[PDB]
Amino acid sequence: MFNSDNLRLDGKCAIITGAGAGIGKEIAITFATAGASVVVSDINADAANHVVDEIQQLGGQAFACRCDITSEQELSALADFAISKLGKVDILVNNAGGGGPKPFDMPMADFRRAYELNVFSFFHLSQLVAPEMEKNGGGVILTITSMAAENKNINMTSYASSKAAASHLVRNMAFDLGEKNIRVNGIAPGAILTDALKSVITPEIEQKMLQHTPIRRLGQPQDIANAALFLCSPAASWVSGQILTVSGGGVQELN
Amino acid sequence: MFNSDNLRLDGKCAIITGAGAGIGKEIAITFATAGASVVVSDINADAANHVVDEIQQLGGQAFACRCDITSEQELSALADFAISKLGKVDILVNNAGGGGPKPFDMPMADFRRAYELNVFSFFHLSQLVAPEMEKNGGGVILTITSMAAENKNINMTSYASSKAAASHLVRNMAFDLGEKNIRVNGIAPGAILTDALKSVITPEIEQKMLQHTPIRRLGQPQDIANAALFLCSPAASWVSGQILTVSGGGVQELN
Amino acid sequence: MFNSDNLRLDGKCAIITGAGAGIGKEIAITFATAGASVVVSDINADAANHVVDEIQQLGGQAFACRCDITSEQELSALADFAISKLGKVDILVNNAGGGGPKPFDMPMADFRRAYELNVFSFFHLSQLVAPEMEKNGGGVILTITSMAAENKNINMTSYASSKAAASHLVRNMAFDLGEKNIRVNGIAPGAILTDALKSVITPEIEQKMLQHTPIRRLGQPQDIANAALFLCSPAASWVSGQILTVSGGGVQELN
Amino acid sequence: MFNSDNLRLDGKCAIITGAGAGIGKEIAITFATAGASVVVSDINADAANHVVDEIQQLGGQAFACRCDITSEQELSALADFAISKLGKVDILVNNAGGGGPKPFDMPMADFRRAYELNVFSFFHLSQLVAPEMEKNGGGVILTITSMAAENKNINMTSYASSKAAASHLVRNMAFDLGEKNIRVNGIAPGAILTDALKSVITPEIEQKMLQHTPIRRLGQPQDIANAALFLCSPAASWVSGQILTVSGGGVQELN
Ligand SMILES: NC(=O)C1=CN([C@@H]2O[C@H](COP(=O)(O)OP(=O)(O)OC[C@H]3O[C@@H](n4cnc5c(N)ncnc54)[C@H](O)[C@@H]3O)[C@@H](O)[C@H]2O)C=CC1
Ligand SMILES: NC(=O)C1=CN([C@@H]2O[C@H](COP(=O)(O)OP(=O)(O)OC[C@H]3O[C@@H](n4cnc5c(N)ncnc54)[C@H](O)[C@@H]3O)[C@@H](O)[C@H]2O)C=CC1
Ligand SMILES: NC(=O)C1=CN([C@@H]2O[C@H](COP(=O)(O)OP(=O)(O)OC[C@H]3O[C@@H](n4cnc5c(N)ncnc54)[C@H](O)[C@@H]3O)[C@@H](O)[C@H]2O)C=CC1
Ligand SMILES: NC(=O)C1=CN([C@@H]2O[C@H](COP(=O)(O)OP(=O)(O)OC[C@H]3O[C@@H](n4cnc5c(N)ncnc54)[C@H](O)[C@@H]3O)[C@@H](O)[C@H]2O)C=CC1
Question: How the protein assembles, per its UniProt entry (chains A, B, C, D)?
Fold first, then answer.
């Protein structure tokens, strides 16, 4: 039977990376307003702090922390910070990442960078957080991958393969952590209206994108936040190892 | 930001096939109690009526329809009855299906039956409902497929291939119906405790299933009803052409 | 070490459906010239007979049979004919099929037709042929599916879902028949230059298709025949349940 | 029509990494005996030299190169040595890789090592070779990934996710290199009898593997060499961006 409480995050403590803007920001606000206490992390301390204020304005509990996910030291600090501020961790939303389009002949530095952003940071932070969740009797890890993990196109070698690594990591991690009663899932968004997309889109590309999208409109950070809430809520207690695609039923590519 | 009303079906009218028991029943009760007026269809009239009583007592709005999904005539009858009783149709939950394990040398009647149950019925009911939804400016169609659509094992030719067809129909129908502003998704359940699972499961099989499921337990009709609620709710307005697997992160097979 | 004999079909007897033209014709000629005796079946007896002549001109062994794959009676006759002419069956190449683009509101007759052509015929013929292969100690079944089994687009509900059923049938049949030492595989071609494609393509559609194909050219029946040979040869003795896609690395769609 | 010469590598020059043993060795011998001049690279010099002798005795043309794929410096050295010895490079077989099962709490060095082995090396060697192939008007790149790229199980995070990245890199690289007229494919082997499999397999595990494999037997290096020959031959001129699984139609896992 319907139970509104299972759709809420009352008393859960969550860490959210790259939450100063875009998708992460919206996930933070939705989670905080759904009842969770949140640590808003970002490499931009100002942005992270502004999000904290908004959450407080809405009557939520939140703390800011500048954390560059591409640093194992900063990741460890982030975990220590959340535990001292929240007392425990129930949810990890690994949202920060990126990399974007790159030519095949890119320097190896750029290729590896995409792995630092989407894979190594994600795996290490989960290693840091897992013991805490285990002590509390379980938890939920959620990562934001990309449709690029399944799409095939030119100028996407680093971005697409690193996101594909992260998506498969989710399927396998679900096994190692299932015994600790931790669920692991991911969301693969299509084109979502954020500054990240704005830096690479054009009107022509936009029209083409809409041409290949059944529910004709680009995505909004709230579409992703809604999906994140469900996947991290008790309403999805038997959903693990899955990657949910939010795309309006279509595909949006640069080509 | 979180909005509890975006996770409800207030003022929505839904048709649910095979709602007399198991997963179908749970979806019917969960939807009614989340605000939707429900038409409970099932081949077993007594079961349909019982569910309708359970809903009304819960303060819900529901009607019963003895419909055999494998009959073109009874499908359009179901369609007519629902629009007359409910006034409109916003949601179609194609749950009824089946078939099960069968030996390679089964009569062609058996092989074809799986397709009558999981494919032709589904497709035809959608054609019947789509014009109504189009007239209203939108709607949602959800079908219950199965992990069999992705698993490979012995004695599963008819069941697995017909569910695979239903899953791929979902990805393509999303394109055709997207123009009418209709979303189409499916849920692929793993081992769910219903009379159906109970008819082929043995304690030896259960143990194997569990040893291959990270979130160690068998699914429950409620796990599927929760996912169905989300997929059919306004919170999933940009989710289409997707199949969500509810499996505890593992795989439950008979072999 | 390299062994040219493992790439040949010396002394094998093969049945090939829809072999009067296009892909099937080329598979027949390549198989016959690789050492196999072949039964060339088609609904067009004249076309089937012309292929037989060409094979004989090339010095191969071949027999023609008019067989409408959408008739269980004609399928049974085809199996009886091949056994009386060849004495045994080692290989079945289920190539006939089709259906093409259809609007969502197509008559149910058209939707079912695609299943008759791509699924039911394929399954029944395999049931007919399996015992023969079993008596000879094994065999190989190969079906020609389509990239439509994975592609998503409008006006493809019947075609795409029926091909998806056939592809998953292959993955599951491999299990039932593995015990009889029969391998089962499929080939999913992209756009191949045949009259079937010619009936639906246009210059604009052609350019677009080439725009999305890395190895820039449309496919030829020989590309498919080459793949068919490998998959049915002793060189692929441990390849079963697979679907090989021949597409130039791209995707060719009507939209 | 059949043409034995289209299945050979006469006059082609190939670089094969990890060719000192197992799958790599078999590919080297099979390619040399099908007509190609081969550069056998391996970290183990003695093994590389031995293979070179075996080939020459078979009347083949080969050279040895002690290359550690995990070194950017040794990779460009390998590239330079091959173009100097062979004169040109037409085929690159990226075979060397590894990593294996690892616990979730493994040192980050271990997690990163799998990526050095299966991803960064592969990508960088391809960048080094692509210009040569482009100059000649074409070439072929083949990488040996693994069924781990699709399987999900415990103790496989590093190995499975890095192989998943290598497989997706293949699908995307096909686009970038297609313009240079270069085809890119991969082969995902199941359980193959090599010293590597022998280091983690136990008679109890073998039996389980076999009970889940329709074509009941474990793979052999030759099964992979046969598939590699085909994918790198003119017979596969329109096959790109694909991963061919050689698995006996089943799944072989450690759990
Ligand atoms: N925007 C889109 O269309 C899609 C985005 N994604 C993924 O969503 C995630 C977020 O992207 P958007 O919200 O669109 O981007 P955005 O640019 O709008 O927001 C990214 C936020 O993360 C922060 N950030 C950047 N580097 C960081 C680092 N090294 N450490 C910690 N925080 C850092 C930024 O300062 C910014 O506040 C990424 O993982 C991206 O790959 C996936 C699919 C679609
Ligand atoms: N139980 C499980 O483990 C899983 C079930 N499924 C799917 O879920 C759906 C429902 O399954 P369960 O709830 O387990 O079954 P169930 O047997 O518990 O309930 C099925 C209901 O469908 C009704 N029904 C059967 N044939 C009908 C027909 N021809 N026309 C109208 N109504 C009909 C029955 O009277 C019954 O009330 C099916 O499509 C099944 O394939 C998918 C994955 C797992
Ligand atoms: N042409 C393409 O681009 C692609 C074709 N396919 C598949 O390849 C297969 C063959 O198609 P094409 O060679 O292009 O077509 P085609 O039209 O060139 O040849 C089809 C042949 O099969 C025969 N045929 C038709 N109906 C038959 C029936 N009921 N019973 C027996 N034989 C029958 C025809 O008379 C004809 O000789 C089909 O299964 C098709 O879906 C898959 C992917 C791509
Ligand atoms: N054996 C199996 O069951 C399967 C193996 N694979 C993959 O096949 C590839 C080769 O595997 P096997 O033939 O089984 O291994 P193997 O151990 O039998 O042979 C590996 C060869 O690679 C060489 N090698 C190792 N590291 C190297 C490095 N850093 N630089 C240069 N050479 C190096 C070794 O000296 C050895 O000669 C690997 O990528 C592996 O992941 C994939 C699926 C199954």
Answer: Homotetramer.
